[PDB]
Design a protein around this ligand. Sequence first.
Ligand SMILES: CCCCCCCCOCCOCCOCCOCCO
Ligand SMILES: CCCCCCCCOCCOCCOCCOCCO
Ligand SMILES: CCCCCCCCOCCOCCOCCOCCO
Ligand SMILES: CCCCCCCCOCCOCCOCCOCCO
Ligand SMILES: CCCCCCCCOCCOCCOCCOCCO
Ligand SMILES: CCCCCCCCOCCOCCOCCOCCO
Ligand SMILES: CCCCCCCCCCCC[N+](C)(C)[O-]
Ligand SMILES: CCCCCCCCCCCC[N+](C)(C)[O-]
Ligand SMILES: CCCCCCCCCCCC[N+](C)(C)[O-]
Ligand SMILES: CCCCCCCCCCCC[N+](C)(C)[O-]
Lengths: 758, 150
Amino acid sequence: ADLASQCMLGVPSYDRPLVQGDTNDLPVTINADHAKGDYPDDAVFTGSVDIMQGNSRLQADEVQLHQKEAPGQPVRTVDALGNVHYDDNQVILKGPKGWANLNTKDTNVWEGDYQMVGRQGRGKADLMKQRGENRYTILDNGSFTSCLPGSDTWSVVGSEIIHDREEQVAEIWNARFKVGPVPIFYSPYLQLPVGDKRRSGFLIPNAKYTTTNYFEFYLPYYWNIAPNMDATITPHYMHRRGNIMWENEFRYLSQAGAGLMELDYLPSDKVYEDEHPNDDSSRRWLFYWNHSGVMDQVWRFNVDYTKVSDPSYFNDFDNKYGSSTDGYATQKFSVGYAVQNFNATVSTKQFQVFSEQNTSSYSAEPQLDVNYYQNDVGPFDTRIYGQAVHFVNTRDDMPEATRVHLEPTINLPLSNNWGSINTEAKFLATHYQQTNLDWYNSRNTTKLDESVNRVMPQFKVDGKMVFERDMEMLAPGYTQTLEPRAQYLYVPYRDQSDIYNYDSSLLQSDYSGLFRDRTYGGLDRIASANQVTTGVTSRIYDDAAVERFNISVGQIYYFTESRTGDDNITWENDDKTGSLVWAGDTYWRISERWGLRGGIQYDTRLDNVATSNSSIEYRRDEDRLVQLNYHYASPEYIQATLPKYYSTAEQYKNGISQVGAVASRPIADRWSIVGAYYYDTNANKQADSMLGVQYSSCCYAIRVGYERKLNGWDNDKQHAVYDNAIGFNIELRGLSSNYGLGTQEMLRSNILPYQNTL
Amino acid sequence: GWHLRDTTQVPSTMKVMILDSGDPNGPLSRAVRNQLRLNGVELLDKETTRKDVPSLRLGKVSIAKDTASVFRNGQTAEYQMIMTVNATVLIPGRDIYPISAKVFRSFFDNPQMALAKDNEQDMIVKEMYDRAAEQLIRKLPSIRAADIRS
Ligand SMILES: CCCCCCCCOCCOCCOCCOCCO
Ligand SMILES: CCCCCCCCOCCOCCOCCOCCO
Ligand SMILES: CCCCCCCCOCCOCCOCCOCCO
Ligand SMILES: CCCCCCCCOCCOCCOCCOCCO
Ligand SMILES: CCCCCCCCOCCOCCOCCOCCO
Ligand SMILES: CCCCCCCCOCCOCCOCCOCCO
Ligand SMILES: CCCCCCCCCCCC[N+](C)(C)[O-]
Ligand SMILES: CCCCCCCCCCCC[N+](C)(C)[O-]
Ligand SMILES: CCCCCCCCCCCC[N+](C)(C)[O-]
Ligand SMILES: CCCCCCCCCCCC[N+](C)(C)[O-]
């Protein structure tokens, strides 16, 4: 059986009927051998004493009921004098003596022990207490563990332990952490993230060895700051760098939505000091802020923000909010208002570029986007888009701009069961004020103009048909569709060469991409278009009408050349018109556990495939899977879409031919083994390699892992630089719902992470 | 044996429905509402008094951006965007049927064009919502057929 059920074997019971509502006026059953006293105010029971009200069951040798002074409203005090056993749908308590106030719900049990019902955890204390209407559990000289009875694996003890049910956190004074009877850690005061609604067990110290830092260790400290905020402070020692990286994480929930901040700070670095002797400081740091939320269904807030001390940061330090595969850090803020027919968004976009060829980058400071939609005018749908943006460079010698844009659009949609057509007419109107042109214009033949207008109509017409047939020959009840689709697109030529290109990159065209009406993103380059796109998709549906297969192929035929008036693209030939661009795609779900996918993009101007991808996957479940995949990008494609130096530089110019394999298998329901290998076939070299092993039990889990990855490039020896890391991690289980074997997390841990392809 | 499709993309019992989610003004809800409208579906409020009306409830999108391939220095060449959507179709009398969409799109990185690349990403994401909506619609006949069978 699976881990979860094995663990549930040791979690007690809860028999007896579950009562809904309160316990207040519910009947009270009392069995004993004797009742002395005046019953309502003073009662002393005895022998075999058993009491039941609602979900609670008390049992003891002697029980005393009382009432009291402070006239007020009625004061009810209960005492239990031997072999005390308390039982309910939450907890089981046992001890020599007990006390309760039924009005305030405050309770004491002396020299007692507790065990949860319906979930893991148990422990003991000199004094167990309930306070604040069962919000607070207090253990004087207490212990806790999530271990099943009979299992001594680990425990936490303290002179004082206070668990807060609402905040889901325990404070522990004089905490000691124990493995078996042996304490291995002491702390005067600790806070731990512990509660029934917690998604992760509380953290413990761990360690790893790396090529970059040598020996490393971390001491996570949880801090519950206030309601809706918490933090984790993690000193992280890195030996080679001779100092401590102080990692700080802050998490919050607000009305504006949820967020996280990270500030990691390394006061001095020996390695960086040696690589930069003349530099003012060796400190290294990272700040990261992520926020997203939608408030009152209308306001939408977003922050994606990363700033580092220097371009080598992610090559040097752990990849969590960033990666050593990143070419730049993104800094983005946006606020927007959206209702059904309207939205407007203001935003800032800045970038910190890593490599030095040019670290110069354009920013949008700010950008305003507006959309208005009206669907009902006659048979027509209408909309208007508009944008205002201010572009600024990090360099002071580079063009600055303001750009305003208006794009009204009207279309006539028409539909049958078998057919569809849509006609669309649109105007594109853009105005630029460009400044700081002096430096640019002295270095260039083609001049940028201060004032630019670009106005131009667009016409587009789309159509699709769906043909069907039965396939009995394939299998009973199978259906096949044929879906031809065609588009004509016309936009007139406008010479844009006097406009700097700030925001426009060449888009990839996969099958869906073929039908897009733009060659570039952004507004700075809009290609002329006179063209017809044609394609066909075929789909196969099974007896249950589930699509099991599709394939699609299409091309774009150009009646005239696509021109912006500034065309910098280095192609392999002069082809202008005809079918230049082709793309195809396929998906096959072979069985419940098996699938394959592929796509290809081809452009005749490259005399080659632009890019292609392939994958096949077997997956039985989250713990058991195998995947092979392939990615290709041609040297011609690199030379066409990327800056000149990529085409001349060894780490770039060959493009991508990359095979990878990923696999995981579970063992004995407690073990998970996982591996991934990624290989460049041009260079006959490893891109990435990873192995991991995890063992999971009811009260804890242990993962050893390894990764060797490309970390950079050595300009002298002209070869790749690799980083190796190997590490151990121990987590506490039974503190949350997770019975997983950690397969998925491990599959996500490397620089080329796993994605389920079906 | 090809014949023009004689049936509607959306099953007859689904030609009137409730659209519901926690982000009705978001882009996923817009893409879905638009696809339903182009398929000739009448959308009603969840407050409507017309009974026996199926309800499409959209869960929250997940959008991941992963490094798909690296250059020889370990820098990202191609990024992969993955969009996943969970939804349910409640046929008020019978049962609750989960459906999902998954969309992959990719693009090449350009640190010298970062601002441009950011815009490219926006464009791609905006298109993926449309794809997701389409995927969900194409799963409707399987719901209709699964309900008849049981
Ligand atoms: C005199 C009998 C004590 C009444 C038991 C109240 C239990 C209700 O809360 C259960 C959930 O909290 C877990 C309790 O943790 C154990 C320590 O508290 C024991 C109270 O003395
Ligand atoms: C670009 C905009 C990013 C927004 C910055 C984060 C907003 C900071 O939160 C402050 C507002 O939160 C108010 C808290 O309201 C009290 C109740 O909320 C707590 C539970 O949601
Ligand atoms: C950007 C940071 C935004 C963080 C939001 C902070 C807003 C704090 O609001 C908390 C309101 O919640 C009150 C509930 O308090 C629970 C415990 O308090 C009881 C007194 O002990
Ligand atoms: C490589 C395509 C395999 C498709 C098999 C799916 C058919 C569903 O039932 C088959 C059960 O057996 C699984 C296939 O056995 C694995 C050996 O073949 C895979 C070749 O690597
Ligand atoms: C279907 C195959 C997919 C998995 C391939 C993974 C291969 C990666 O392993 C590389 C082995 O290199 C040896 C590593 O050096 C010692 C570290 O190994 C200790 C394991 O934790
Ligand atoms: C030099 C030894 C190579 C043999 C290693 C075993 C096979 C590993 O490579 C398998 C992939 O083969 C390369 C396929 O090339 C992709 C096509 O694009 C390259 C154009 O030249
Ligand atoms: C560009 C060199 C200056 C680096 C100095 C440190 C800048 C970090 C600023 C972090 C604050 C970001 N925030 C939240 C205010 O927007
Ligand atoms: C409503 C606009 C109609 C657009 C259809 C255009 C058909 C073009 C056929 C492909 C090219 C024909 N050609 C030039 C190769 O002979
Ligand atoms: C196929 C484009 C570039 C890939 C490089 C080598 C991989 C060969 C894969 C052949 C499969 C092609 N096809 C059409 C059958 O899918
Ligand atoms: C760490 C202090 C424990 C005090 C006892 C209170 C019982 C809370 C148990 C929390 C565990 C939640 N659980 C079982 C779902 O993981």
